[PDB]
Amino acid sequence: MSELILHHYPTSLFAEKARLMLGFKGVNWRSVTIPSIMPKPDLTALTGGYRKTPVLQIGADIYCDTALMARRLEQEKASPAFYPQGQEFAVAGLAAWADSVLFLHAVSLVFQPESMPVEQVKHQWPTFMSRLESQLSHGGDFLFGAPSIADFSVAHTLWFLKQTPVTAPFVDDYPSVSVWLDRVLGFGHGSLSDLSSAAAIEIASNATPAPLPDETFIDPNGFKAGDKVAIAAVEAVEGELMFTGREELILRREDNRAGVVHVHFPRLGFRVEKR
Amino acid sequence: SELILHHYPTSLFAEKARLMLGFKGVNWRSVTIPSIMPKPDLTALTGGYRKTPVLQIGADIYCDTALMARRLEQEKASPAFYPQGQEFAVAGLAAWADSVLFLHAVSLVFQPESMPVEQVKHQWPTFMSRLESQLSHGGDFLFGAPSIADFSVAHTLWFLKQTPVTAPFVDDYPSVSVWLDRVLGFGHGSLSDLSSAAAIEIASNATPAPLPDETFIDPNGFKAGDKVAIAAVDYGVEAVEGELMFTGREELILRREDNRAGVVHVHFPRLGFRVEKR
């Protein structure tokens, strides 16, 4: 009931970073395969309706957003660190930038007919890569020296390019970049055991949610524990707020199959509204 | 003596060959080629054909996955890519999947929606429903026993599985999805990395295998000893020049001498390749 459970579609390119993250942490995990097909009732039984995946379940706690997932893992196994001491702000920021701008570029490059506004993406790509090549040319192991969540965010974008002969040069034309990527990819996926989605529900149902964090925080919007709330990504999830924090929001819901569950959201990328 | 595969490891396009190695249960060497042009260690063996994956055994180089299957079949007969009594039917189905089916699958995936298509979208359900109808009967594989055809069909589906948006193109037919996992489950076999340079040396030290004893009269009058170029019909640019050593029902063999790799025999199928006198 305290096992790390990942809800994902195993063949998806988009889910690769989460698996790599587990690989980096060297942990055992349970793999729950989710449907490509709508709807995904077994999944929303845990989520309350949030369907972007991967999702991480530990017992009766559900964690939404890979970015949040990274932090939760950090609580689970400190070492090696996603966020190395003294670089916390810098790492997160680079990681967020990669997750947005870099990722967008990479996917636009790959998913177009020539691989069998894109023009602006092509136009911008070289500056990003040349800058990466330049930093790497100095022989550092990782972007921040020591490995961090930022490597995975950048590495994930590059993984798409490596998929086809046509897109591979976008990474490969810069040699230093290529060696670095193999190093991040070399982390693996950890060790996984298949789990049914049915069982996953049963585990949540049996289990009791973890104790809330002791952090004291004043919500800039005056949201407080006990408030009835809905949270949505920028399918909203309805529930009772249990916590407001610098990094997370926790909401409580009861499900007919899964029972009482706590769903975690990061502040960033999510909006909270009253009801 | 070792089987050597020259490929790009992360390429979706090279998956079928890897599965082929898995089905055979053979141990092979993996040579990781460059995405970037040109590919000198590769053309050192090929003579400039650059479509991979490519199969090397000693100083014999095999081009085209369709040919590769037959060479494999020679190396390990069972389990068979072409089951007895179903040979023509299997080859034809694979050829169809390799072209028509593959084309649809790639069109669907490599479009912006995933991050003439309309015709492809219109067509796709006809193929999938048919496949679903056959599988619903509980047959393990397309022809009873497994075949090169399962792989050819499976390879196309593998592209769809890559994306959440495209996965329903497979997942909507349950029988297909089960079958697909079975085909993918043969895996890639057992590999050890081999450097590209090491591969050239192996060719140099090796000597090309004896030619087939088959007797055939070429349709176009080509004969052993003619000076020839061979090119893929699609990609006339990378023609390969040499001395025709064998012309056969399934095969053309050409001898060339490379400054690094030495004397080498390069094998091409009749299908998809053109022979020009030189």
Added chain:
Amino acid sequence: ELILHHYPTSLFAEKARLMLGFKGVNWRSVTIPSIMPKPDLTALTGGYRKTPVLQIGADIYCDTALMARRLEQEKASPAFYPQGQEFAVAGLAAWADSVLFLHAVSLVFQPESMEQVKHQWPTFMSRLESQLSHGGDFLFGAPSIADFSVAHTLWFLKQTPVTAPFVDDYPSVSVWLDRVLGFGHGSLSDLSSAAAIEIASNATPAPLPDETFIDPNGFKAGDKVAIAAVDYGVAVEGELMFTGREELILRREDNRAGVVHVHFPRLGFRVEK
């Protein structure tokens, strides 16, 4: 309202399933969890593992044999035990559920075998075929709880193609089997393990049946007893509300479910003070 707790996937639960269809009732189905811990069930049950288990309100009925009898009470027709054939029907059914069934699981689970199960089996089948050869609808002419017991084992065999021939090779048998399976599972609606509990704490147990019994072991209501299954017991503490010819009843207090009555048949259950 009628609820079954079972494993919908389990081959073993088919019999309880066929029973409801035959009575044609509407029931609510609580799936029993695949993972190991099954507290959702045990709160009602108080410790009895084996399924299916039948719940009405605050009364839990353990053992399908008993279940058939409570069913009989709930809707009388068609009867599980036809009038004037009651003993014979119970016996054959008990024989099938024990001997015939055990042979069938063995044939499946232990096909390498030769008491020699494979050696025995043809005798049972040739006998069934002969009786059936007479155009009988059902084993006792009217349909019986007995037909289900026999049918269930045969169906189990047919679920795997290798074992099918054990059934399939007897032709008259096949027809009869289909007629039995025709009853289907009736009509069901899903229900939470959670919901069921609320009904237990919410509801009150039905009134005790009233018959006078001299319990052979001097067991009388208000004694504190543990009731345990003889074959696979690991017991259920409680207080004996009732000791009867067909039933024994236990009251227990459960924190989630509060006060409930558990019903056990006399056969296969041991009582202790």
Added chain:
Amino acid sequence: SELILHHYPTSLFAEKARLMLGFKGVNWRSVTIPSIMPKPDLTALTGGYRKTPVLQIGADIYCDTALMARRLEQEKASPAFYPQGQEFAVAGLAAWADSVLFLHAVSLVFQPVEQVKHQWPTFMSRLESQLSHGGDFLFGAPSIADFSVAHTLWFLKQTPVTAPFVDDYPSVSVWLDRVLGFGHGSLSDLSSAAAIEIASNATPAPLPDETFIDPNGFKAGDKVAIAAVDYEAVEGELMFTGREELILRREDNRAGVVHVHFPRLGFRVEKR
């Protein structure tokens, strides 16, 4: 040479061999054994020892699940059945599981039950205790022992009434899911007729390079019969006597020359 397993698909006992194949990850061919007798096709290969499952590679036939593991180990080394430096401890635990634990489980499922039930909790609590430490497998790295134990538990759970014996000790489930997680691997059907032909066409593998003095004096070239200890003896020429193995040559009308492999343990060798 392909890996061929002849087995009863529904047999609960046959699952251990199936699991072993999956752990190894080497694709295999599946020949179903008919529930009927005669089984002229299997017998042709083994000479009648009918205990199954059986592993066939060409003209070499391996009997006994423990022997199979060693043969598989030779075929592909990793992941190992017998991790280096733990080999004896692993073999012994596995043998113990194969006998005492498995026998307890069969008793519960199909039937000294009281003694069995009385005993079982000791084994299970001991297993929970080791498992609570959070190690991945029984010897750390996965081993043959994990399957032998896991197999008996899976067996228990095949029928609902007996599942509580596993279920009642919840700590074991995480390790159990993980062992069972390996699966059966990649299998495709092969007909018994086709299997016989594979044997007929093949020639037995080279004998092992081992010098050994047989304790009872048997020698290569001796003519013998080999039987299970509690039992139907196949008759032949003793090709090899070794520390783990005895190899028997026999000839069959359809099969042709075939080599049958037996472990020393559990088999009696007679000068016959």
